[model samples]
Target: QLTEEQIAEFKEAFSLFDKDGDGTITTKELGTVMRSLGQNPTEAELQDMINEVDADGNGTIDFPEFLTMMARKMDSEEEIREAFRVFDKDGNGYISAAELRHVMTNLGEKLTDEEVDEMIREADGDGQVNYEELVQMMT
Candidate 1:
């Protein structure tokens, strides 16, 4: 779990990327900030990243989307492992629809019921996912 301080830091980092101070970050702003961080994102890469997290087509990333992006970008294996431990709520060694919904909701997203179900179906293969699959999805 991220501490209050850590969450605050993340919020601050997000604010830096929200160039217009509009409480949401757009893809262009995100790409600029990511480039500054040495990410070297091409236009297509930036658009892809935005599409993955921006469940709504608002042209800006809300807090939930920002958190999702950051979680995917964690550099350490340990960090990824910890996230899986928390997100894998059923202890079934695979993530369920409820687990993903709960996590995304807490991060400030209001995913549609259908969207949540589709996400689970797309993420799981053979109705199970091992650590490797989880890590690949998370990263």
Candidate 2:
């Protein structure tokens, strides 16, 4: 998990990616910013990353969207663990559809019913998942 300071830094970086103050960060914007930062991502790679983070299908990433994506890319297991905990509601160490939706909503993205169902179908294999399962999927 990132400290509040780190979260602020991430938001700042993401805002830089937005470039146009549109409250949305697109693949083009991300790629440009990443390349400028010396991480040259191909268009396909950029799109893949965007698809994974842009849950609202708004073609842009919001603050929570970017943080969730960055959390998955962290090299530290502890960081990933903390990130999972942040989203795991019911305090059962697992993420449900409701939990995922809560996280997304907190990040300023409102998910539709179909989107929620699709996320559950993709992430939950046994019709139910525990915290371990949720972390594994995120990683």
Candidate 3:
């Protein structure tokens, strides 16, 4: 289940696309929203997502169905969050130098202090790696 804050954020996002005060979103609206977010989604690709959610074949998305779509997209980010949790030993959502070093050294073979410190210097901006920063460090 989404947290209240997260659900509210999703509601805000959904309302952004619910133009004309309509309670549903069309495929065109979805495309515009994706493009507004810097994505170049084609009509067919966007339609596929709509079809995935539009089992009733209405060719539009209601708020309840939009939650399904958002949940689908949220899964991948949640996977990254799970990975971050692995290194965030203290539940602070930030990876400390000691935690990073321990994982790097114990995850497989031993990593040299030089290598670990270098990675920390690159990924940790303010003495710790936040969840968002860890995604880039990963890829």
Candidate 4:
């Protein structure tokens, strides 16, 4: 599913700070790239994004490691869209606050009214925030 441009981009970008050409990226390498791009990421944030997704406990990410990442993201993506289907009521195409409450309770994390309201707001900006507009939220 990877394209040539995608491949070339990661290849070239990774190669840029991979210095040793060993085909992996560390926090230090990524930090260098981000600094050049004029962005700063904290150590803990970098550790979470990179280390949590690391395929092995080696503290770095290589190409296969990258695929391991895309694997999880690509698969969970479909599950997110499919998850809301058919169970909806009112037929208005918005996921009901009621529905979220029921699901959360049964899933064993019962929520407070404020918590529910917060969840709804998190997705829609309003309860009917609608589908693709909340795409990044769900995605």
- Residue 53's lDDT within candidate 2 is 84
- What is the C-alpha lDDT profile of model 3 across 56-139, one tens digit per residue? 789988888877677763336668778778767678778877778888887875789898877677773567867666565554
The C-alpha lDDT values of all candidates are 0.70, 0.72, 0.78, 0.68
lDDT of 2 by residue, 12-33 (tens): 8877788888778888888888
Judged by TM-score relative to the true structure, which candidate is superior, 2 or 4?
4
Summarize candidate 1's per-residue lDDT along 1-139 as a digit string, tens digits: 5556767878888878887877787778978888888777788878787777787887668887787677664467677767767766567667655556676656754777676666565563554545545456655
Per-residue lDDT over 34-120 for candidate 4, one digit per residue giving the tens place of the 0 to 100 score: 889987888987878788767798899887777556545435655665556555555566776667667755665467767766667
Off by over 4 Å in 1: 1-3, 37-40, 68-139
List the candidates' TM-scores in order: 0.44, 0.43, 0.46, 0.50
- CA lDDT, candidate 3, residue 72: 64
Query: Which is better, 2 or 3, measured by lDDT?
Result: 3
Q: Which stretches of candidate 2 lie over 4 Å from their true place?
A: 1-3, 38-40, 71-139
For candidate 3, the 10 contiguous residues with the lowest summed lDDT are 69-78
Give the poorly placed runs of model 4, Cα more than 4 Å off. Answer: 2-6, 70-128, 136-139
Candidate with the greatest lDDT versus the true structure? 3
